[PDB]
Amino acid sequence: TAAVTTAWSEQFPNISASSTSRDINNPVIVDYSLPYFENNVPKDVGIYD
Amino acid sequence: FSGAPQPNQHHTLVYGKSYHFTITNGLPEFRHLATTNSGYYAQQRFKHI
């Protein structure tokens, strides 16, 4: 209603990563199902393979 | 006899300079600008460009 000029601000509530560097965190999770009472389980994934 | 006027003058100038400037980083910032005649603009300044 009052289209007045505002002050400069670096505080972008959520600026796109297409305009600047932005932190993201999406760790991959490996599941090892245990459907039975006594399950057959493998050794942890050897990520280096 | 066959007369003819003098030519127009055509000069070519060549100039040049060299400078040493320094610039720095800057996070992006935004604001809204209001101007006379009800002008309204959304502005985004890249302090690193």
Side-chain angles (χ1 to χ4, degrees):
Chain A
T1 295
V4 64
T5 147
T6 67
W8 286 103
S9 173
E10 295 174 350
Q11 253 68 299
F12 281 99
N14 177 44
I15 187 178
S16 179
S18 302
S19 298
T20 42
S21 163
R22 285 183 69 54
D23 57 297
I24 59 172
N25 183 61
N26 183 41
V28 61
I29 305 176
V30 179
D31 296 309
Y32 299 107
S33 291
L34 302 169
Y36 296 92
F37 283 104
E38 184 55 58
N39 306 285
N40 180 23
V41 177
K43 170 186 172 186
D44 309 309
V45 56
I47 67 174
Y48 299 112
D49 292 313
Chain B
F1 176 90
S2 186
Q6 44 176 33
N8 288 309
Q9 307 312 303
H10 296 291
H11 301 315
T12 156
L13 300 67
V14 176
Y15 289 103
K17 270 65 188 180
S18 69
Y19 313 104
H20 182 169
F21 294 119
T22 56
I23 52 183
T24 61
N25 273 299
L27 240 45
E29 60 189 9
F30 69 111
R31 59 111 85 125
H32 280 269
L33 212 206
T35 63
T36 55
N37 298 302
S38 303
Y40 195 51
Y41 313 87
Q43 287 181 159
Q44 182 167 48
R45 176 162 59 187
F46 294 96
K47 288 146 67 179
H48 62 87
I49 300 177

Coordinates of all heavy atoms in Angstrom, one line a residue:
Chain A
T1 N 0.8 -1.2 0.0 CA 0.0 0.0 0.0 C 0.9 1.2 0.0 O 0.6 2.2 -0.6 CB -0.9 0.0 1.2 OG1 -1.8 -1.1 1.2 CG2 -1.7 1.3 1.3
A2 N 2.0 1.2 0.7 CA 3.0 2.2 0.8 C 4.2 1.7 0.1 O 5.2 1.3 0.8 CB 3.2 2.6 2.3
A3 N 4.3 1.8 -1.2 CA 5.4 1.4 -2.0 C 6.6 2.3 -1.8 O 7.0 3.0 -2.8 CB 5.0 1.3 -3.5
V4 N 7.1 2.3 -0.6 CA 8.3 3.1 -0.3 C 9.6 2.4 -0.5 O 9.6 1.1 -0.5 CB 8.2 3.6 1.2 CG1 8.3 2.5 2.1 CG2 9.3 4.7 1.5
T5 N 10.7 3.1 -0.6 CA 12.0 2.5 -0.7 C 12.5 1.9 0.6 O 12.3 2.6 1.6 CB 13.0 3.6 -1.3 OG1 14.3 3.3 -0.8 CG2 12.6 5.0 -0.9
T6 N 13.1 0.8 0.5 CA 13.6 0.1 1.7 C 15.2 0.1 1.8 O 15.8 0.4 0.8 CB 13.1 -1.3 1.9 OG1 13.6 -2.1 0.8 CG2 11.6 -1.3 1.8
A7 N 15.7 -0.3 2.9 CA 17.2 -0.4 3.1 C 17.8 -1.7 2.5 O 17.1 -2.7 2.4 CB 17.5 -0.3 4.6
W8 N 19.0 -1.6 2.1 CA 19.7 -2.7 1.5 C 19.9 -3.8 2.6 O 20.0 -3.4 3.8 CB 21.1 -2.3 1.0 CG 21.1 -1.5 -0.3 CD1 21.3 -0.2 -0.4 CD2 20.9 -2.0 -1.6 NE1 21.2 0.2 -1.7 CE2 21.0 -0.9 -2.5 CE3 20.6 -3.3 -2.1 CZ2 20.8 -1.1 -3.9 CZ3 20.4 -3.4 -3.5 CH2 20.5 -2.3 -4.4
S9 N 19.8 -5.0 2.2 CA 20.0 -6.1 3.1 C 20.5 -7.4 2.5 O 20.2 -7.7 1.4 CB 18.6 -6.4 3.7 OG 18.6 -7.6 4.6
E10 N 21.4 -8.0 3.2 CA 22.0 -9.3 2.8 C 21.2 -10.4 3.3 O 21.4 -11.6 2.9 CB 23.5 -9.4 3.3 CG 24.4 -8.3 2.8 CD 25.8 -8.4 3.4 OE1 25.9 -9.2 4.4 OE2 26.7 -7.7 3.0
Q11 N 20.3 -10.1 4.2 CA 19.4 -11.1 4.8 C 18.3 -11.7 3.9 O 17.1 -11.4 4.1 CB 18.8 -10.6 6.1 CG 19.4 -11.1 7.4 CD 20.8 -10.7 7.6 OE1 21.7 -11.0 6.8 NE2 21.0 -10.0 8.7
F12 N 18.7 -12.4 2.9 CA 17.7 -13.0 2.0 C 17.0 -14.2 2.8 O 17.7 -15.2 3.1 CB 18.3 -13.6 0.8 CG 18.7 -12.5 -0.3 CD1 20.0 -12.1 -0.3 CD2 17.7 -12.1 -1.1 CE1 20.3 -11.1 -1.3 CE2 18.1 -11.1 -2.1 CZ 19.4 -10.6 -2.2
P13 N 15.7 -14.1 3.0 CA 15.1 -15.2 3.7 C 15.4 -16.5 3.1 O 15.6 -17.5 3.8 CB 13.6 -14.9 3.6 CG 13.5 -14.0 2.4 CD 14.7 -13.1 2.5
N14 N 15.5 -16.6 1.8 CA 15.9 -17.8 1.1 C 16.3 -17.5 -0.4 O 15.5 -17.7 -1.3 CB 14.8 -18.8 1.1 CG 15.1 -20.1 0.3 OD1 16.2 -20.6 0.4 ND2 14.1 -20.6 -0.4
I15 N 17.5 -17.0 -0.6 CA 18.0 -16.7 -1.9 C 18.3 -18.0 -2.7 O 18.8 -18.9 -2.0 CB 19.2 -15.8 -1.9 CG1 19.5 -15.3 -3.4 CG2 20.4 -16.5 -1.3 CD1 20.7 -14.4 -3.4
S16 N 18.0 -18.0 -4.0 CA 18.3 -19.2 -4.8 C 19.8 -19.5 -4.9 O 20.6 -18.6 -4.8 CB 17.7 -19.1 -6.2 OG 18.0 -20.2 -6.9
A17 N 20.2 -20.8 -5.0 CA 21.6 -21.2 -5.1 C 22.0 -20.9 -6.5 O 23.2 -21.1 -6.9 CB 21.7 -22.7 -4.8
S18 N 21.1 -20.4 -7.3 CA 21.4 -20.0 -8.7 C 22.0 -18.6 -8.7 O 22.5 -18.1 -9.8 CB 20.2 -20.0 -9.6 OG 19.5 -21.3 -9.5
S19 N 22.0 -17.9 -7.6 CA 22.5 -16.6 -7.5 C 23.7 -16.5 -6.5 O 24.4 -15.5 -6.6 CB 21.4 -15.6 -7.0 OG 20.3 -15.6 -8.0
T20 N 23.8 -17.5 -5.6 CA 24.9 -17.5 -4.7 C 25.1 -18.9 -4.0 O 24.2 -19.6 -3.9 CB 24.9 -16.5 -3.6 OG1 23.5 -16.4 -3.1 CG2 25.4 -15.1 -4.0
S21 N 26.3 -19.1 -3.6 CA 26.7 -20.3 -2.9 C 25.8 -20.6 -1.7 O 25.4 -19.6 -1.0 CB 28.1 -20.1 -2.3 OG 28.5 -21.1 -1.3
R22 N 25.3 -21.8 -1.6 CA 24.4 -22.2 -0.5 C 24.7 -23.6 0.0 O 24.9 -24.5 -0.8 CB 22.9 -22.0 -0.9 CG 22.5 -20.6 -1.0 CD 21.0 -20.4 -1.4 NE 20.1 -20.8 -0.3 CZ 20.2 -20.4 1.0 NH1 21.1 -19.5 1.3 NH2 19.3 -20.8 1.9
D23 N 24.7 -23.7 1.3 CA 25.0 -24.9 2.0 C 23.9 -25.9 1.9 O 22.7 -25.6 2.1 CB 25.3 -24.6 3.5 CG 24.2 -23.9 4.2 OD1 23.9 -22.8 3.8 OD2 23.6 -24.5 5.1
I24 N 24.3 -27.2 1.7 CA 23.3 -28.3 1.6 C 23.9 -29.5 2.3 O 25.1 -29.7 2.4 CB 23.0 -28.7 0.2 CG1 24.3 -29.1 -0.6 CG2 22.3 -27.5 -0.5 CD1 24.0 -29.7 -1.9
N25 N 23.0 -30.3 3.0 CA 23.4 -31.5 3.7 C 22.5 -32.6 3.4 O 21.3 -32.6 3.9 CB 23.5 -31.2 5.2 CG 24.0 -32.3 6.0 OD1 25.1 -32.8 5.8 ND2 23.1 -32.8 6.9
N26 N 23.0 -33.6 2.7 CA 22.1 -34.7 2.3 C 22.9 -36.0 2.4 O 23.2 -36.7 1.4 CB 21.5 -34.6 0.9 CG 20.6 -35.7 0.5 OD1 19.8 -36.2 1.4 ND2 20.7 -36.1 -0.7
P27 N 23.3 -36.5 3.6 CA 24.1 -37.7 3.8 C 23.3 -38.9 3.3 O 22.1 -39.0 3.5 CB 24.2 -37.7 5.3 CG 24.2 -36.3 5.7 CD 23.1 -35.8 4.9
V28 N 24.0 -39.8 2.6 CA 23.4 -41.0 2.1 C 23.3 -42.0 3.3 O 24.2 -42.1 4.1 CB 24.2 -41.7 1.0 CG1 25.6 -42.1 1.5 CG2 23.5 -42.9 0.4
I29 N 22.1 -42.7 3.3 CA 21.9 -43.7 4.4 C 21.8 -45.1 3.8 O 21.1 -45.3 2.8 CB 20.6 -43.4 5.2 CG1 20.6 -41.9 5.7 CG2 20.4 -44.3 6.3 CD1 19.3 -41.5 6.4
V30 N 22.5 -46.0 4.4 CA 22.4 -47.4 4.0 C 21.6 -48.2 5.0 O 22.0 -48.3 6.2 CB 23.9 -48.0 3.9 CG1 23.8 -49.5 3.4 CG2 24.7 -47.2 2.9
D31 N 20.6 -48.9 4.5 CA 19.7 -49.7 5.3 C 20.1 -51.2 5.3 O 20.5 -51.7 4.2 CB 18.3 -49.6 4.9 CG 17.7 -48.2 5.1 OD1 17.8 -47.6 6.2 OD2 17.1 -47.7 4.1
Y32 N 20.0 -51.8 6.4 CA 20.3 -53.3 6.5 C 19.0 -53.8 7.2 O 19.0 -53.9 8.4 CB 21.5 -53.5 7.4 CG 22.8 -52.9 6.9 CD1 23.3 -51.7 7.5 CD2 23.5 -53.4 5.8 CE1 24.5 -51.2 7.1 CE2 24.6 -52.8 5.3 CZ 25.2 -51.7 6.0 OH 26.3 -51.1 5.5
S33 N 18.1 -54.2 6.4 CA 16.8 -54.8 6.9 C 17.0 -55.9 7.9 O 17.8 -56.8 7.7 CB 15.9 -55.2 5.7 OG 15.4 -54.1 5.0
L34 N 16.1 -56.0 8.9 CA 16.1 -57.0 9.9 C 14.7 -57.4 10.1 O 14.1 -57.3 11.2 CB 16.7 -56.4 11.2 CG 18.1 -55.9 11.1 CD1 18.5 -55.1 12.4 CD2 19.1 -57.0 10.9
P35 N 14.0 -58.0 9.1 CA 12.6 -58.4 9.1 C 12.3 -59.6 10.0 O 11.2 -59.7 10.5 CB 12.3 -58.7 7.6 CG 13.7 -59.3 7.2 CD 14.6 -58.3 7.8
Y36 N 13.3 -60.5 10.2 CA 13.1 -61.7 11.0 C 13.6 -61.4 12.4 O 14.1 -60.3 12.7 CB 13.9 -62.8 10.4 CG 13.4 -63.3 9.0 CD1 13.9 -62.7 7.9 CD2 12.3 -64.2 8.9 CE1 13.4 -63.1 6.6 CE2 11.8 -64.5 7.7 CZ 12.4 -64.0 6.5 OH 11.9 -64.3 5.3
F37 N 13.4 -62.4 13.3 CA 13.9 -62.3 14.7 C 15.4 -62.6 14.6 O 16.2 -61.9 15.4 CB 13.2 -63.3 15.6 CG 11.8 -62.8 15.9 CD1 10.7 -63.4 15.3 CD2 11.6 -61.8 16.8 CE1 9.4 -63.0 15.6 CE2 10.3 -61.3 17.1 CZ 9.2 -61.9 16.5
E38 N 15.8 -63.5 13.8 CA 17.2 -63.8 13.6 C 17.6 -63.6 12.1 O 17.2 -64.5 11.3 CB 17.5 -65.3 14.0 CG 19.0 -65.6 13.9 CD 19.9 -64.7 14.8 OE1 19.6 -64.6 16.0 OE2 20.8 -64.1 14.2
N39 N 18.2 -62.5 11.8 CA 18.5 -62.1 10.4 C 19.9 -62.5 10.0 O 20.9 -62.6 10.8 CB 18.3 -60.6 10.3 CG 16.9 -60.2 10.6 OD1 16.0 -60.5 9.9 ND2 16.8 -59.6 11.8
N40 N 20.1 -62.6 8.7 CA 21.4 -62.9 8.1 C 21.8 -61.5 7.6 O 21.2 -60.8 6.8 CB 21.2 -63.8 6.8 CG 22.5 -64.1 6.1 OD1 23.6 -64.1 6.7 ND2 22.4 -64.5 4.9
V41 N 22.9 -61.1 8.2 CA 23.5 -59.7 8.0 C 24.8 -59.7 7.4 O 25.7 -60.5 7.7 CB 23.5 -58.9 9.3 CG1 24.1 -57.6 9.1 CG2 22.1 -58.8 9.9
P42 N 25.1 -58.7 6.5 CA 26.4 -58.6 5.8 C 27.3 -57.6 6.5 O 26.8 -56.9 7.4 CB 26.0 -58.0 4.4 CG 24.9 -57.0 4.8 CD 24.1 -57.8 5.8
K43 N 28.6 -57.6 6.2 CA 29.5 -56.7 6.8 C 29.2 -55.3 6.2 O 28.7 -55.2 5.1 CB 30.9 -57.1 6.4 CG 32.0 -56.1 6.8 CD 33.4 -56.5 6.3 CE 34.4 -55.4 6.5 NZ 35.7 -55.7 5.9
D44 N 29.4 -54.2 7.0 CA 29.2 -52.9 6.5 C 29.7 -52.6 5.1 O 30.8 -53.1 4.8 CB 29.8 -51.8 7.4 CG 29.4 -52.0 8.9 OD1 28.2 -52.2 9.2 OD2 30.4 -52.1 9.7
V45 N 29.0 -52.0 4.3 CA 29.4 -51.7 2.9 C 30.9 -51.1 2.9 O 31.2 -50.3 3.7 CB 28.5 -50.6 2.2 CG1 28.4 -49.4 3.1 CG2 29.0 -50.3 0.8
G46 N 31.7 -51.7 2.0 CA 33.0 -51.2 1.9 C 33.0 -50.1 0.9 O 33.2 -50.4 -0.3
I47 N 32.8 -48.9 1.3 CA 32.7 -47.8 0.4 C 33.9 -47.6 -0.5 O 33.8 -47.0 -1.6 CB 32.6 -46.4 1.2 CG1 33.8 -46.1 2.0 CG2 31.4 -46.5 2.1 CD1 33.8 -44.8 2.7
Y48 N 35.1 -48.1 -0.2 CA 36.2 -48.0 -1.0 C 36.2 -49.0 -2.2 O 37.1 -49.0 -3.0 CB 37.5 -48.2 -0.2 CG 37.6 -47.1 0.9 CD1 37.5 -47.5 2.3 CD2 37.7 -45.8 0.6 CE1 37.5 -46.5 3.2 CE2 37.8 -44.8 1.6 CZ 37.6 -45.2 2.9 OH 37.6 -44.2 3.8
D49 N 35.2 -49.8 -2.3 CA 35.1 -50.8 -3.4 C 34.1 -50.1 -4.4 O 33.8 -50.7 -5.4 CB 34.5 -52.1 -2.9 CG 35.5 -52.9 -2.0 OD1 36.7 -53.0 -2.4 OD2 35.0 -53.4 -0.9
Chain B
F1 N 40.4 26.3 -67.7 CA 40.5 26.3 -66.3 C 39.4 25.5 -65.7 O 38.3 25.5 -66.2 CB 40.5 27.8 -65.7 CG 40.6 27.9 -64.2 CD1 41.8 28.0 -63.6 CD2 39.4 27.8 -63.5 CE1 41.9 28.1 -62.2 CE2 39.5 27.9 -62.1 CZ 40.7 28.0 -61.4
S2 N 39.7 24.8 -64.6 CA 38.7 23.9 -64.0 C 39.0 24.0 -62.4 O 39.9 23.3 -61.9 CB 38.8 22.5 -64.5 OG 37.7 21.7 -63.9
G3 N 38.1 24.8 -61.7 CA 38.3 24.9 -60.3 C 37.7 23.8 -59.5 O 37.0 23.0 -59.9
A4 N 38.1 23.8 -58.2 CA 37.7 22.8 -57.2 C 38.1 23.3 -55.8 O 39.2 23.9 -55.6 CB 38.4 21.5 -57.5
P5 N 37.2 23.1 -54.8 CA 37.4 23.6 -53.5 C 38.5 22.8 -52.8 O 39.0 21.7 -53.3 CB 36.0 23.3 -52.8 CG 35.1 23.2 -53.9 CD 35.8 22.5 -55.0
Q6 N 38.9 23.2 -51.6 CA 39.9 22.5 -50.8 C 39.1 21.4 -50.1 O 37.9 21.4 -50.0 CB 40.5 23.4 -49.7 CG 39.4 24.3 -49.0 CD 40.0 25.1 -47.9 OE1 41.2 25.5 -47.9 NE2 39.2 25.3 -46.8
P7 N 39.8 20.3 -49.6 CA 39.2 19.2 -49.0 C 38.7 19.5 -47.6 O 39.0 20.5 -47.0 CB 40.3 18.1 -49.0 CG 41.4 18.7 -49.9 CD 41.3 20.1 -49.7
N8 N 37.9 18.6 -47.0 CA 37.5 18.7 -45.6 C 38.7 18.1 -44.9 O 39.5 17.4 -45.5 CB 36.3 17.9 -45.3 CG 35.0 18.5 -45.9 OD1 34.7 19.6 -45.8 ND2 34.3 17.6 -46.6
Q9 N 38.9 18.4 -43.6 CA 40.0 17.8 -42.9 C 39.5 16.5 -42.2 O 38.4 16.5 -41.7 CB 40.5 18.8 -41.8 CG 40.9 20.2 -42.4 CD 41.7 20.1 -43.7 OE1 42.8 19.5 -43.7 NE2 41.2 20.7 -44.8
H10 N 40.4 15.5 -42.2 CA 40.1 14.2 -41.6 C 41.3 13.8 -40.8 O 42.3 13.4 -41.3 CB 39.8 13.2 -42.7 CG 38.6 13.5 -43.5 ND1 37.3 13.4 -43.0 CD2 38.5 13.8 -44.8 CE1 36.5 13.7 -44.0 NE2 37.2 14.0 -45.1
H11 N 41.1 14.0 -39.4 CA 42.2 13.6 -38.5 C 41.9 12.4 -37.7 O 40.7 12.2 -37.4 CB 42.5 14.8 -37.6 CG 42.9 16.0 -38.3 ND1 43.8 16.1 -39.3 CD2 42.5 17.3 -38.0 CE1 44.0 17.3 -39.7 NE2 43.2 18.1 -39.0
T12 N 42.9 11.6 -37.4 CA 42.6 10.4 -36.6 C 43.4 10.5 -35.3 O 44.6 10.8 -35.3 CB 43.0 9.1 -37.4 OG1 43.3 8.1 -36.5 CG2 44.2 9.4 -38.3
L13 N 42.8 10.3 -34.2 CA 43.4 10.4 -32.9 C 43.5 9.0 -32.2 O 42.6 8.2 -32.3 CB 42.6 11.3 -32.0 CG 42.5 12.8 -32.4 CD1 41.6 12.9 -33.6 CD2 41.8 13.6 -31.2
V14 N 44.6 8.8 -31.5 CA 44.9 7.5 -30.9 C 45.4 7.8 -29.5 O 46.5 8.3 -29.3 CB 45.9 6.6 -31.6 CG1 46.2 5.4 -30.9 CG2 45.3 6.3 -33.0
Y15 N 44.7 7.4 -28.5 CA 45.0 7.6 -27.1 C 44.9 6.3 -26.3 O 44.3 5.4 -26.8 CB 44.1 8.7 -26.4 CG 44.4 10.1 -26.9 CD1 43.6 10.7 -27.9 CD2 45.5 10.8 -26.5 CE1 43.8 12.0 -28.3 CE2 45.8 12.1 -27.0 CZ 44.9 12.7 -27.9 OH 45.1 14.0 -28.3
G16 N 45.5 6.3 -25.1 CA 45.4 5.1 -24.2 C 46.0 5.3 -22.9 O 47.0 6.1 -22.7
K17 N 45.5 4.5 -21.9 CA 46.0 4.6 -20.5 C 46.1 3.2 -19.9 O 45.6 2.2 -20.5 CB 45.1 5.4 -19.7 CG 45.4 6.9 -19.6 CD 45.3 7.6 -21.0 CE 45.8 9.0 -20.9 NZ 45.6 9.6 -22.3
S18 N 46.8 3.1 -18.8 CA 47.0 1.8 -18.1 C 46.7 2.1 -16.6 O 47.2 3.1 -16.1 CB 48.3 1.2 -18.3 OG 49.3 2.0 -17.6
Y19 N 46.0 1.3 -15.9 CA 45.7 1.5 -14.5 C 45.9 0.3 -13.7 O 45.9 -0.9 -14.2 CB 44.2 1.9 -14.3 CG 43.8 3.0 -15.3 CD1 43.0 2.7 -16.4 CD2 44.2 4.4 -15.1 CE1 42.5 3.7 -17.2 CE2 43.7 5.4 -15.9 CZ 42.9 5.0 -17.0 OH 42.5 6.0 -17.9
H20 N 46.0 0.5 -12.4 CA 46.2 -0.6 -11.4 C 45.1 -0.4 -10.4 O 45.2 0.5 -9.5 CB 47.6 -0.6 -10.8 CG 47.9 -1.7 -9.8 ND1 49.1 -2.0 -9.3 CD2 47.0 -2.6 -9.3 CE1 49.0 -3.0 -8.5 NE2 47.8 -3.4 -8.4
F21 N 44.1 -1.3 -10.4 CA 43.0 -1.3 -9.4 C 43.0 -2.5 -8.6 O 43.6 -3.5 -8.9 CB 41.7 -1.1 -10.2 CG 41.5 0.2 -10.9 CD1 41.3 0.2 -12.3 CD2 41.6 1.4 -10.2 CE1 41.2 1.4 -13.0 CE2 41.4 2.6 -10.9 CZ 41.2 2.6 -12.3
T22 N 42.2 -2.4 -7.5 CA 42.1 -3.5 -6.5 C 40.6 -3.6 -6.2 O 40.0 -2.5 -5.9 CB 42.9 -3.4 -5.3 OG1 42.5 -2.1 -4.6 CG2 44.4 -3.4 -5.6
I23 N 40.0 -4.8 -6.2 CA 38.6 -4.9 -5.9 C 38.5 -6.1 -4.9 O 39.4 -6.9 -4.7 CB 37.8 -5.2 -7.1 CG1 38.4 -6.4 -7.9 CG2 37.7 -4.0 -8.0 CD1 37.7 -6.7 -9.2
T24 N 37.3 -6.1 -4.1 CA 37.1 -7.2 -3.1 C 35.7 -7.8 -3.1 O 34.8 -7.4 -3.8 CB 37.4 -6.6 -1.7 OG1 36.4 -5.6 -1.5 CG2 38.8 -6.1 -1.6
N25 N 35.6 -8.9 -2.3 CA 34.4 -9.6 -2.1 C 33.2 -8.8 -1.7 O 33.4 -7.6 -1.3 CB 34.7 -10.7 -1.0 CG 35.2 -11.9 -1.6 OD1 34.6 -12.6 -2.4 ND2 36.4 -12.3 -1.1
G26 N 32.1 -9.4 -1.7 CA 30.9 -8.7 -1.2 C 29.7 -9.7 -1.4 O 29.5 -10.3 -2.4
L27 N 28.9 -9.8 -0.4 CA 27.7 -10.7 -0.4 C 26.6 -9.9 -1.2 O 26.6 -8.7 -1.2 CB 27.3 -11.0 1.0 CG 27.2 -12.4 1.5 CD1 28.5 -13.2 1.1 CD2 27.1 -12.4 3.0
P28 N 25.7 -10.7 -1.8 CA 24.6 -10.0 -2.5 C 23.6 -9.4 -1.5 O 23.4 -9.9 -0.4 CB 24.0 -11.2 -3.3 CG 25.1 -12.1 -3.4 CD 25.7 -12.1 -2.1
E29 N 23.0 -8.3 -2.0 CA 22.0 -7.6 -1.1 C 20.8 -7.1 -2.0 O 21.0 -6.9 -3.2 CB 22.7 -6.5 -0.3 CG 23.3 -5.4 -1.2 CD 24.1 -4.4 -0.4 OE1 24.3 -4.7 0.8 OE2 24.5 -3.4 -1.0
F30 N 19.7 -6.9 -1.3 CA 18.5 -6.4 -2.0 C 17.8 -5.3 -1.3 O 18.0 -5.1 -0.1 CB 17.5 -7.6 -2.2 CG 16.9 -8.0 -0.9 CD1 15.5 -7.8 -0.7 CD2 17.7 -8.7 0.1 CE1 15.0 -8.2 0.5 CE2 17.1 -9.1 1.3 CZ 15.7 -8.8 1.5
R31 N 16.9 -4.6 -2.0 CA 16.1 -3.5 -1.5 C 15.1 -3.2 -2.5 O 15.0 -3.8 -3.6 CB 17.0 -2.3 -1.3 CG 17.7 -1.8 -2.5 CD 17.2 -0.4 -3.0 NE 17.8 0.7 -2.3 CZ 18.4 1.7 -3.0 NH1 18.5 1.7 -4.3 NH2 19.0 2.7 -2.3
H32 N 14.2 -2.3 -2.2 CA 13.1 -1.8 -3.1 C 13.3 -0.3 -3.2 O 13.6 0.3 -2.2 CB 11.8 -2.2 -2.5 CG 11.4 -3.6 -2.7 ND1 10.7 -4.0 -3.8 CD2 11.7 -4.7 -2.0 CE1 10.5 -5.3 -3.8 NE2 11.1 -5.8 -2.7
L33 N 13.3 0.2 -4.4 CA 13.5 1.6 -4.7 C 12.2 2.3 -5.1 O 11.5 1.9 -6.0 CB 14.5 1.8 -5.7 CG 15.5 3.0 -5.7 CD1 15.9 3.3 -7.1 CD2 14.7 4.2 -5.1
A34 N 11.9 3.4 -4.4 CA 10.8 4.2 -4.7 C 11.3 5.5 -5.3 O 12.3 6.1 -4.8 CB 9.9 4.5 -3.5
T35 N 10.7 6.0 -6.4 CA 11.2 7.2 -7.0 C 10.0 8.1 -7.4 O 8.8 7.7 -7.3 CB 11.9 6.9 -8.3 OG1 11.1 6.3 -9.3 CG2 13.1 6.0 -8.0
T36 N 10.3 9.3 -7.8 CA 9.2 10.3 -8.2 C 8.4 9.7 -9.3 O 8.9 8.8 -10.0 CB 9.8 11.6 -8.6 OG1 10.7 11.4 -9.7 CG2 10.5 12.3 -7.5
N37 N 7.2 10.2 -9.5 CA 6.3 9.7 -10.5 C 5.8 8.2 -10.2 O 5.5 7.4 -11.0 CB 6.9 9.7 -11.9 CG 7.3 11.1 -12.3 OD1 6.4 12.0 -12.4 ND2 8.6 11.3 -12.6
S38 N 5.8 7.9 -8.9 CA 5.4 6.6 -8.4 C 6.2 5.4 -8.9 O 5.7 4.3 -9.0 CB 3.9 6.4 -8.7 OG 3.1 7.4 -8.2
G39 N 7.5 5.7 -9.2 CA 8.4 4.6 -9.7 C 8.7 3.7 -8.5 O 9.0 4.1 -7.4
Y40 N 8.6 2.4 -8.8 CA 8.9 1.3 -7.9 C 9.7 0.2 -8.5 O 9.3 -0.2 -9.6 CB 7.6 0.8 -7.3 CG 7.8 0.0 -6.0 CD1 8.5 0.5 -4.9 CD2 7.2 -1.3 -5.9 CE1 8.6 -0.2 -3.7 CE2 7.3 -2.0 -4.7 CZ 8.0 -1.5 -3.6 OH 8.1 -2.1 -2.4
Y41 N 10.9 -0.1 -7.9 CA 11.7 -1.1 -8.5 C 12.3 -2.1 -7.5 O 12.5 -1.7 -6.3 CB 12.9 -0.5 -9.2 CG 12.5 0.7 -10.1 CD1 12.4 2.0 -9.6 CD2 12.2 0.5 -11.5 CE1 12.0 3.0 -10.4 CE2 11.8 1.5 -12.3 CZ 11.7 2.8 -11.8 OH 11.2 3.8 -12.6
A42 N 12.5 -3.3 -7.8 CA 13.1 -4.3 -6.9 C 14.6 -4.3 -7.4 O 14.8 -4.5 -8.6 CB 12.5 -5.7 -7.1
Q43 N 15.5 -4.1 -6.5 CA 16.9 -4.1 -6.8 C 17.7 -5.1 -6.1 O 17.5 -5.4 -4.9 CB 17.5 -2.7 -6.5 CG 17.0 -1.6 -7.5 CD 17.7 -0.3 -7.2 OE1 17.7 0.6 -8.1 NE2 18.1 -0.1 -6.0
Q44 N 18.7 -5.7 -6.8 CA 19.6 -6.7 -6.3 C 21.0 -6.3 -6.7 O 21.4 -6.3 -7.9 CB 19.2 -8.0 -6.9 CG 20.0 -9.2 -6.4 CD 19.4 -10.5 -6.8 OE1 19.0 -10.7 -7.9 NE2 19.4 -11.4 -5.8
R45 N 21.8 -6.0 -5.7 CA 23.2 -5.6 -5.9 C 24.2 -6.6 -5.6 O 24.2 -7.1 -4.5 CB 23.5 -4.3 -5.1 CG 24.9 -3.9 -5.3 CD 25.1 -2.4 -4.8 NE 24.7 -2.2 -3.5 CZ 24.6 -1.0 -2.9 NH1 24.9 0.1 -3.6 NH2 24.2 -0.9 -1.6
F46 N 25.0 -7.0 -6.6 CA 26.1 -8.0 -6.4 C 27.4 -7.3 -6.0 O 28.2 -6.9 -6.9 CB 26.2 -8.8 -7.7 CG 25.0 -9.6 -8.0 CD1 24.0 -9.1 -8.9 CD2 24.8 -10.8 -7.3 CE1 22.9 -9.9 -9.1 CE2 23.6 -11.6 -7.6 CZ 22.7 -11.1 -8.5
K47 N 27.7 -7.2 -4.7 CA 28.9 -6.6 -4.2 C 30.2 -7.3 -4.6 O 31.2 -6.8 -4.2 CB 28.7 -6.4 -2.7 CG 27.7 -5.3 -2.4 CD 27.0 -5.6 -1.1 CE 27.9 -5.6 0.1 NZ 27.1 -5.9 1.3
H48 N 30.1 -8.4 -5.3 CA 31.3 -9.2 -5.6 C 31.5 -9.2 -7.1 O 32.4 -9.8 -7.6 CB 31.1 -10.6 -5.1 CG 30.0 -11.4 -5.7 ND1 30.1 -12.1 -6.9 CD2 28.7 -11.6 -5.3 CE1 28.9 -12.6 -7.2 NE2 28.1 -12.3 -6.2
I49 N 30.6 -8.4 -7.8 CA 30.7 -8.3 -9.3 C 30.8 -6.8 -9.6 O 29.9 -6.1 -9.5 CB 29.4 -8.8 -10.0 CG1 29.2 -10.3 -9.7 CG2 29.6 -8.7 -11.5 CD1 28.0 -10.9 -10.3

